[PDB]
Design a protein around this ligand. Structure first.
Ligand SMILES: *SCCNC(=O)CCNC(=O)[C@H](O)C(C)(C)COP(=O)(O)OP(=O)(O)OC[C@H]1O[C@@H](n2cnc3c(N)ncnc32)[C@H](O)[C@@H]1OP(=O)(O)O
Length: 267
């Protein structure tokens, strides 16, 4: 016979290292939901007046984000010509202040909430409600589509790289959308909307909860520099990545602490 291998009396020991790293990471950067994201955007507007703090309640989804962007751009086009707006209105903003934001904006920060299971807008909202009630993130995810109007650039940011679909499939969908926007919101010089898929690799490695904060951090990097290469200059170590992100979150949460709730800043 052969000597049986030793089986340790510790069920989970083989995973300790990975479990420990994840626990540390989840603790450093917990989930950012719709409400704190909105506050952060309001705050970002005070720093960068070009950013319109679009409401995240309810957020866009993969089923309606294009229609949502088109409604907004059509309304901005209308405001600039003294025409009436036709799109759905914000709940925390007066109609007049909203028109002022539309006139002034050069950048739409479009957060999209996503879950693999729902197959309609309505079912996505239902899934969102169930998860909120049980206090669970689950397989849900935040994505950011930046509509840079001034540069005519659509920037898609997935901190999980390919959670919704392969990057080339999203590139295709967004490239078709970009040519639609060329007709909807035409440029004088005929410059075409271009598309950027921001992440070449998984950004939030080791976390199931840091997506919201990652979206906001990338947005802030983009606001600092619309050609930011920050994603390429990240620490290789995932814990270190989230340590820096934790510093961002802390700074943001401090900055909005005494800012007014449920109301847009003046344009
Ligand atoms: S910032 C967020 C970034 N997102 C990610 O990183 C995604 C990473 N993937 C995961 O975290 C995994 O999906 C794991 C760890 C397995 C999460 O577990 P689940 O796959 O079970 O998560 P679910 O979304 O499937 O749901 C979990 C709980 O929520 C309930 N639930 C409600 N509603 C739905 C719908 N419409 N589809 C699935 N589940 C759903 C479930 O009953 C479940 O309840 P629990 O009591 O928490 O098990």
């Amino acid at each position: 016979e052969d000597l049986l291998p030793l089986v340790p009396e510790q069920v989970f020991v083989e995973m300790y290292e990975d479990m420990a790293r994840r626990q540390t990471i989840e603790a450093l950067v917990p989930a950012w939901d719709s409400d704190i994201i909105f506050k952060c955007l309001c705050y970002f507007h005070t720093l960068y007046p070009g950013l319109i703090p679009l409401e995240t309640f309810p957020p866009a989804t993969i089923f309606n984000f294009k229609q949502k962007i088109i409604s907004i751009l059509e309304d901005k086009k209308a405001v600039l010509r003294g025409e009436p707006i036709k799109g759905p209105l914000p709940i925390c903003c007066s109609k007049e202040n909203y028109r002022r934001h539309l006139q002034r904006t050069t950048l739409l920060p479009v957060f999209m909430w996503y879950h693999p299971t729902p197959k309609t807008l309505s079912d996505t909202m239902q899934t969102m409600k169930q998860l909120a009630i049980k206090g669970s993130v689950g397989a849900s995810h935040w994505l950011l589509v930046i509509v840079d109007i001034q540069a005519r650039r659509l920037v898609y940011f997935d901190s999980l790289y390919n959670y919704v679909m392969p990057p080339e499939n999203m590139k295709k969908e967004l490239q078709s959308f970009a040519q639609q926007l060329d007709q909807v919101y035409p440029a004088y010089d005929s410059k075409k909307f271009s598309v950027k898929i921001a992440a070449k690799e998984v950004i939030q490695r080791g976390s199931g909860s840091s997506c919201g904060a990652w979206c906001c951090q990338f947005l802030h990097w983009y606001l600092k520099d619309p050609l930011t290469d920050a994603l390429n200059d990240l620490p290789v170590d995932s814990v270190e990545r989230h340590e820096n992100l934790a510093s961002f979150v802390q700074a943001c949460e401090a900055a909005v602490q005494d800012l007014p709730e449920l109301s847009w800043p003046e344009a």
